[PDB]
């Protein structure tokens, strides 16, 4: 029973413990140790579920615990206490480790390796919480213990790398609890949580660890936007302190998505669209990335519709994600066909859907775009057209009504016309002749500049693995 599963599971945890130990004790190469540890977590979450769940307590007693065994027992009671073949003398050794040394070195006293035992202990904890899906007390318990400990060290870059990945989970459980239960307590500690992240982020500037900085930035940007204040988030990003050294495919895709959401609702859709295109691009394409991609698509359509430029029908059609993009497809059709009444119905029919996903606020400004897109088609199709004919086409009352709408629309430059209320028709002003302007030299210069950017990025990247590789042993 007891002895069987826990011992088996323990064999893998010992092997895992040394993978962290050996890289950091010989000093990190930054990017490479990091990646390994990510591969390590894929394995651990599975093992934690499997073969009881006291596999960790059995382990905690095996390694040098300073007080870590107390916190473990409390996690354990909730999912039904186990504690047989996790007592001393049947799960204890202080030998078989170079991670805790032999017994004699513990006794005599030696240098701390209890830091990395602790960080790694806190891994198993963060893991435990997510895997079981524990809610309520456990969220408070874990957070309050772990973070004081990370500051009782000497704030080493070796230990910063490992514990940075702990921050993601601390953050997940707080939001989950807040979404489930509406309570004054959850509101109250959210102010503590922003405060803490900024505190760490200062510390990690000093100590210059780029991963700790990239992760802490993304969690707190997400938090401000969930509570809906734009201004705090915008002020934060324009200090330009995001790193690019230790950053990842997911991590940079995430940043850009925040950048999109801020700039669109600030009424600049050119600057918003720049980011969202970047976000889809960095991200992998998997069934595990499905969530991220799914939400990226939803935001993309609307940013584009707000410009008055329309997404193609093949987008939605060949999507495997098409039965959630169905209110979004109707947004495309309704704007394009210019019909006031379809729009009205769409955002009323699909109001719960739009409001769930938070995209309903950008759909309000898409009301304006119905008119704007319809007047645009008309500028393309007709060069000279009476004011009267226009009022029948979009169903407007006065000559006066169309004239207010058109002028504003060409303040933005969307339609590309000029009104002649000296003769009572609207004249289209697009007359091309852009290869007969001076602008084309300038259009090529930016492209040339992007090709120079890849030329640098190639040369500098190439040599970076190669220093290490020529130093590496070979026959």
């Amino acid at each position: 029973l007891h002895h069987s599963e826990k011992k088996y599971a323990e064999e893998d945890q010992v092997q895992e413990l040394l993978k962290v130990l050996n890289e950091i004790s010989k000093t990190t190469l930054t990017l490479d140790p990091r990646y390994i540890w990510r591969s390590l977590k894929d394995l651990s979450s599975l093992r934690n579920q499997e073969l009881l769940n006291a596999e960790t307590l059995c382990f905690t007693v095996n390694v040098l615990y300073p007080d870590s065994s107390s916190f473990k027992k409390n996690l354990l009671k909730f999912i039904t206490s186990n504690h047989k073949s996790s007592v001393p003398g049947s799960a204890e050794l202080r030998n078989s480790y170079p991670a805790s040394f032999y017994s004699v070195n513990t006794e005599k006293k030696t240098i701390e390796v209890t830091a990395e035992i602790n960080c790694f202990m806190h891994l198993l904890v963060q893991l435990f919480l997510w895997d079981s899906k524990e809610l309520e007390q456990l969220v408070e318990f874990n957070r309050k213990v772990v973070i004081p400990n990370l500051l009782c060290y000497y704030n080493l870059r070796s230990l910063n790398l490992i514990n940075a990945k702990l921050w993601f989970y601390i953050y997940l459980s707080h939001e989950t609890l807040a979404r489930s239960s509406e309570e004054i307590n959850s509101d109250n500690q959210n102010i503590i949580l922003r405060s803490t992240m900024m505190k760490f982020l200062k510390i990690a500037s000093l100590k210059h660890d780029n991963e700790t900085k990239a992760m802490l930035i993304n969690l707190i940007l997400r938090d401000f936007l969930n509570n809906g204040e734009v201004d705090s988030a915008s002020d934060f990003i324009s200090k330009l302190e995001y790193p690019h050294t230790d950053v990842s495919s997911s991590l940079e895709a995430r940043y850009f998505f925040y950048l999109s959401k801020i700039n669109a609702i600030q009424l600049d859709y050119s600057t918003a669209n720049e980011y969202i295109i970047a976000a889809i691009r960095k991200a992998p394409h998997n069934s595990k990335s499905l969530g991220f991609l799914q939400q990226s698509n939803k935001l993309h359509c609307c940013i584009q519709l707000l410009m008055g430029d329309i997404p193609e029908l093949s987008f939605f059609h060949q999507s495997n994600m098409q039965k959630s993009l169905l209110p979004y497809y109707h947004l495309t059709k309704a704007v394009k066909l210019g019909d006031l009444k379809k729009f009205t119905s769409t955002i009323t029919k699909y109001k719960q859907l739009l409001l769930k996903d938070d995209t309903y606020q950008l759909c309000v400004r898409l009301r304006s775009n119905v008119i704007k897109t319809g007047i645009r088609i008309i500028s393309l199709t007709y060069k000279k057209i009476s004011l009267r004919d226009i009022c029948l086409k979009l169903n407007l009352d006065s000559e006066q009504t169309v004239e207010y709408m058109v002028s504003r629309a060409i303040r933005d430059g969307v339609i590309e016309a000029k009104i002649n209320h000296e003769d009572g028709f609207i004249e289209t002003t697009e007359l091309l002749n852009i290869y007969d302007s001076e602008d084309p030299q300038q259009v090529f210069d930016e492209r040339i500049k992007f090709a120079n950017q890849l030329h640098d990025e190639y040369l500098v990247s190439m040599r970076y693995p190669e220093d290490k590789k020529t130093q590496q042993n070979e026959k």
Binding site: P66, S100, K109, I111, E112, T114, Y154
Partner: protein, 99 residues
């Protein structure tokens, strides 16, 4: 276990490592030097090709390539009526040179 020595680090920063921060500026000076060296050898490439080009121009004597004996030396026989074993020049066919 527990604890270490925090004075061991603080000591090394001012003493040894200050000398080594300065040493890293002398390898930075190396970088500026070999930035010019790398361009200088591009100029010297131009000059080594130009000199070859003189040799290639006339006067020349006709011969006929037979066959290789190596991938950089061949054997020809001239229109003089003499077999000469000849170094083949770089920057020519050696796949359509063989017949």
């Amino acid at each position: 276990n527990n604890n270490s020595a925090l004075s061991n680090v603080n000591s090394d920063i001012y003493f040894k490592l200050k000398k080594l921060e300065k040493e890293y500026e002398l390898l930075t000076l190396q970088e500026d030097y070999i930035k010019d060296e790398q361009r200088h050898l591009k100029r010297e490439l131009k000059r080594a090709q130009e000199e070859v080009k003189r040799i290639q121009s006339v006067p020349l004597v006709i011969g006929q390539f037979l066959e290789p004996i190596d991938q950089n030396t061949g054997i020809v026989s001239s229109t003089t009526g003499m077999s000469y074993v000849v170094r083949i020049l770089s920057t020519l066919d050696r796949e359509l040179l063989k017949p």
